[PDB]
């Protein structure tokens, strides 16, 4: 149930707080959507136990 | 009245600043306005 974020496009601005979950792309072809190659879930389960 | 934010409809968080006689209704979380955003009146 927790998540942290490991890949952004730049550094937060202090106090900010980014909800939104899309598709994260470092390369020339698109994702469009689809999980993909060289393309990762931003969100990464810490995993307890 | 005035919106900020990055974009509109969904999908991000939107700053929504509108003004009348007596509301200031602020909203950070969702509001529907289209392409061509304005408040209809009658």
Same mark, same amino acid.
Request: glycine letters at 6%; aromatic letters at 14%.
């Given at each position: 149930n927790y998540?942290?974020?490991?890949?952004?496009? =730049?550094?937060?601005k202090?106090?900010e707080?980014?909800? =939104?979950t899309?598709? +994260?792309?470092a @390369?020339?072809? #698109?994702?469009n @959507?689809?999980? @993909? #190659?060289?393309?990762? =879930?931003?969100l990464?389960? +810490?995993g307890?136990? | 009245?005035?919106?900020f934010?990055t974009? $509109?409809?969904?999908k991000?968080?939107s $700053? $929504?600043i &509108?003004?009348?006689?007596?509301?200031? &209704?602020?909203?950070?979380c969702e509001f529907q306005?289209?392409?061509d955003?304005f408040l209809? &009146?009658?």
């Amino acid at each position: 149930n927790y998540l942290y974020r490991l890949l952004r496009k =730049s550094k937060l601005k202090p106090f900010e707080r980014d909800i =939104s979950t899309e598709i +994260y792309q470092a @390369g020339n072809k #698109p994702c469009n @959507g689809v999980a @993909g #190659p060289n393309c990762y =879930s931003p969100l990464q389960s +810490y995993g307890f136990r | 009245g005035w919106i900020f934010g990055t974009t $509109l409809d969904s999908k991000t968080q939107s $700053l $929504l600043i &509108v003004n009348n006689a007596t509301n200031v &209704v602020i909203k950070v979380c969702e509001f529907q306005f289209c392409n061509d955003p304005f408040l209809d &009146v009658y």
